[model samples]
Each structure stands twice: as structure tokens, then as C-alpha cells.
Target: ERAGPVTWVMMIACVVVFIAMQILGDQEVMLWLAWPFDPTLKFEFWRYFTHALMHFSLMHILFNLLWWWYLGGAVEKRLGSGKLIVITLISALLSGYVQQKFSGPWFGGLSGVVFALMGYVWLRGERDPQSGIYLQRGLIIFALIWIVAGWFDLMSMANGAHIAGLAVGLAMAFVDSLNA
Candidate 1:
């Protein structure tokens, strides 16, 4: 498939973030590292949103990158570059914030946002054939299974985070659709 410019930019951004964290020794570098809310410089603003870009372990980054590559590309194709970016940022910040603030711990990753995109598209687009969200019965079932498994903590997944991300993503999309 032909790749969109947005797809490459998204990929590059994820790759660069992953590489930077790897070199920073994880502890020395402050996560939400570039955010104004790092808390380290007394400029803390809940840096939770930017923390979405930080990962704890190699597997964490790898999983996020893999999801972003395919899911982001798909969303970009469906919603165009602009909306894809909007969805990503909204999902990341909102979900990331909830995980950090309510969960009582710092959480980071593209996963929540990624899953959010998946959730929004899965539900909203499914209701309208012209919405540009393509899904098969199998895909829908898989997502349902994933959510259920996550809720049960049987999938080694961050159930609460996924719920937070999906909620944010779906709510944002629902509002966006109304404006359209």
C-alpha cells in the first residue's frame, strides 16, 4: 500500500522517542521529559500527557510502536492526516491524564491512544458505512474479546488505562461527528 506523509511522520516520531528513552538510561532522563509539568523543575503541570511518549521497558515501546504503525496508518487513511492527528493527541492527553491522575501513578504509551482510535472507529464507523471506518465481524469480535479479557485481567493488559483511552477517544469522536 502507498504510504501517506502523515504515516511516515507518525512512525518517525515514535521511533525517535523510543530511541531517546533507550539512550537516557530511563532514570536519568525525566519523562514527560519535554513537558512543562515535569515536577522536577518546579514547572510541573501534570506532565501526564507528554508522559504518553515515555515507556518503561523494551516490550512496552515495541508493542506501542507496532500498534501505532498499523493502527495509525489505518486511521490516517480513513480520517485524513488532520483528523488522525487530532484523534491521536486527544486520545493520548485525555487518557494519559486519567491514568496518571486517577490511577495514582505515572503511565505512558501510545497504547491507550491507539486503543482509543480502535475503539472509536470500531463503534462509530460501524454504525455508518460511509464513515470510512472499515471493520469485519472478526475484527469486531477480536476487539470485544480484548476488552473483556482486559477487564478480567486475563490478558496481561492495562485494563483501566485501555478503558480510559477508549472512553476519551470515543467521546471525542462522537463530538467531532456531530460537528461534521
Candidate 2:
């Protein structure tokens, strides 16, 4: 699938936030977009929305956009852009908030949201085989390994965010299925 306008926007945003984080030397979105921990809600609500855009490393953004570029296109085609956007935005904000709850000094990456996409797509395919969006078997294996690793207290993974994303994605997928 070709890159859509929305994908370009997100790509540009990823690059901008990546550079900004590099220059600012801080990826703590909570500092600016304060989560519940922060006093202000209206002012900080943007953090819930924007934190997903910020990533700490090149690999983080690379893999996330890679997933977006690969799976997002088909998702947009199948689910329609509106529902896809709802799924993505909801997954991003909810998972970002979950991450913020456990964040310390520096919090970065879109893995949680990306994983949400993966989970959503996986379930969607399972729900509607006619969609024919076959995910990579190898990647699925890797995801299983990573998910299990994250579960056992692996320091490198945001286990909570991963679970939240997957759970929410599944719920949304179920809701969407009912509509279908």
C-alpha cells in the first residue's frame, strides 16, 4: 500500500518530535503535557494526545512508523479512515497515559501504540478472514516472545502499556465487529 496523507503527517510529526527531543535533551512529555499527576487537566490533556508522537531513539520511531506504514494502510482501507483514526487515537492516548503512570525521568517511544496497531490488526484479521491482511508469522512469533518477556519483568519493555494496548485494541475490535 502506498503512503497516505495521514501517514505523511505522522511521519513529519515523528521527525519533528525526534529532533525536538534531541535538541531539548528531554523526552519527558509529562513535563509539558502533564498527565493526571500534573495539576492541570485541560492544559495537560494535550499530553495524552501528543505524547505518542515523541520517541527517544531513532529505532523507536523507525519501527513504529514501519508498522504504521505497513499495517496502517490496509487498516485504513478495511476499517475506513474514520474508525481507523478512532482506534489509533484512542489506543495512543490510553496507552500513553498508562506509560506515564510508570514513567520516571525520561519516557519516550511509540512502541505501545505501535503494539496496539499490531494487536488490533491481528485481531481484526482473525475476526474477518476475508480482509486477507496476513501479518508476518515471524513478526508474530517475535511479538509473542517480546510480550512474554515483558510480562516477566523485563526492564527493556513497557509491559503495562503493551498489555493495555492489546486489551484495548481487542475491546475496540470487538466493538467494531458488532457494528460489522
Candidate 3:
């Protein structure tokens, strides 16, 4: 029951989208999904959400969707499908926007959302022990180290999106716990 409907659907959707991107090539999809950071370029509404679905490599998609399933599944199982949708959309758009602004519009992956789920589960598990969504200390340390690695240009990754996603996820969880 942990990897329920929302988690399953999102996982499959990402795979399907990745398959399509492979067939069509990233250039074709990037035009529609990736937003141009220029002020003169017209901003498209769907690009905000769609950007997160674009994956340039098989390894990229695999790493991202796997984490999405693991962390996101736990979150959805605890909070229900509605909250999963909200968190996903908010994280995607916010992270996407920040990434575009910070490093231009040439990036895509579920890593941002993966970090969001990591942040969400980390805090939620702390606040509500019954949620059964605790993250291992090694995973937390690994992710933080990855973030720093990206920040230092040690890896070719969307550093801004990663940071923004974690922030949004933690903030969302914190605020929701307060209201609860």
C-alpha cells in the first residue's frame, strides 16, 4: 500500500514521458517543456510543470524516478494522493522557476522533486513518528553531500533546482504540521 496509486501513476508517467523523449529527441521536447530564461521570450504555462518530466539520459531518469518512487511513495501513502499531487506540482514549478532563473533553461529531471520528497519525508517523519516515512541518516548525508558537490560544480547538475526543491518541501511540511 505504500507505493499506491499516486506513486505508481507518477512513476509510469515519467517512464512514458522518457520513452517519448528518447524517440523524439530532447531538442524537440525541450522547446515546449523547458522555459527560456529571456524576458523577451513568451513564458508558457505548461513549461513550469513539464520541465521536470524531461530527462536527457537513461541514467538520469532512472536515478530520479527511483528516488521519486521510494521517497514519494512513502509520502503519498501517509498523506494520500491529493497531497502528493499538490506537493509534486508546487515543487516542480517552484524548483523549475528557480533553476531557469539561476542557470538558464537547459535542465530537466525529477531530482528536484526527489529532493522535495527527501525533505518532506525527513521532516514529516520527525514530526509524526506514526507516518512510517523516516529517511536513513546515510541517505540524508549523501543527498546533502550531493547538493554541495553540485554547488561546487563538482557535478553537472541542476544545483538551483535541488536547493529550491528541498526548501519548498521542508517549508511545506513545516507549515502543514503547524496547521495540524
Candidate 4:
């Protein structure tokens, strides 16, 4: 009743997957699920999306899940579950691949997808009011600043993933607007 079905399921699924990872505590599992440029993981394509399901710590999971709920819920509410499903999968694939290419694994989180959704909302809202999406200036500034900060090595983040996600998201939003 709150978020769209896909959004709620994704949020719940991330929590469930995180719990399972904790219970497993197996590096092999994480390695298999993560997108690494290493030989062993090169063939495991499923890791593209599964990587987002693993969180390194409590705070990591908390922060990612919160943002997922907030941004994903908004997107799902306006565009319906279908859009969320496509956006989630595509953004995960693109971001994970970019991050792997840049850092060769050792990273996992939903922040990339969150940024994708943010970009989608920002672009779509500006292009089409009927999109039912709106982005705040504070968040836009904060997210951009955060991305820039990552470039300066101020914080450890999947900058490549975030950039790829945002670019794909904005491009998709633009295409969607044109089609609309």
C-alpha cells in the first residue's frame, strides 16, 4: 500500500539477501556474487545485479536500504512497477560493470542505483511534469558534491558505478520523454 509492489519487493529482497550473507559469512559467496574483473568471476553474469544485494556492514546496509526505499519508492509510485523493474536491472548492470572495470571489484552497494534514480527523477521532472517525479536542489547539489568528492579521494565510493548509473538514468529519462 505504501510503495509500488516492485519497490517494496526490492527493498525487502535486499534486506533478506543481506541477512543471508551475514549468516553465510563466506568470502567465496561474496566473491561469486560480486562483479570482479578477475578470471573466476568473468563468466558469472548474474553478479551484475546480485552485487547490490550485499552490504559490508550494518551502517552500509542501513544507508543503502534507506536510500533505496526513498528514491525507488518515489519512482515506482509515479512510473509503476514496470519502470522500476527495468531501471533497477539496467542500472545495476551498467553500474556494476563500470565499477568492476574501474576498481576491479571490492565494492558493493545500492548507492549507484540510488544515484540513477535521482538522475532519472531530476531529468524527467524537468522534461516532463506528467512524469510525476521531482528532484530537490539540495539533494542535487549534495549528490553532485559527493560524486566530485569521490574524485578527489576524499571518500571511498564506487564513483565509476555512480557515474555510469547516473548517465544511463538520465539518458533513459530523456529517451522516455521523447517517446512520451
**Whole-model lDDT per candidate:** 0.67, 0.70, 0.84, 0.84
Cα lDDT of model 2 by residue, 34-145, tens digit: 3445455545456666767777678778978887777777677765677667777888777876776776323545667667777877776778667666467787787788
lDDT of model 4, residue 26: 39
| Clashing residue pairs, backbone N/CA/C < 3 A, model 2 | none
lDDT of 4 by residue, 90-159 (tens): 9999998899889877778888888888889989998987887878899899888878987988858889
In model 3, where do residues sit more than 4 Å from their true spots?
36-43
Name the regions of candidate 2 deviating beyond 4 angstroms: 27-30, 33-36, 102-106, 152-155
Clashing pairs in 1: 37-44, 37-45
Candidate 1 total steric clashes: 2
TM-score of each: 0.77, 0.84, 0.92, 0.91
Backbone N/Cα/C clashes per model: 2, 0, 0, 0
Q: By lDDT, highest first, what's the ranking?
A: 3, 4, 2, 1
Using lDDT, give the best candidate's number. Answer: 3
Question: Candidate 3: minimum summed lDDT over ten consecutive residues — where?
Answer: 35-44
lDDT of 3: 0.84
Model 2: worst 10 consecutive residues (lDDT sum): 27-36
Alpha-carbon RMSD to native, per candidate: 3.2, 2.6, 1.7, 1.7
lDDT tens digits, residue span 62-95, model 1: 8777767666777778778887777777776666
**Alpha-carbon shift of residue 66 in model 4 (angstroms):** 1.8
lDDT of 1: 0.67
Per-residue error at 132 for model 4, in Å? 1.3
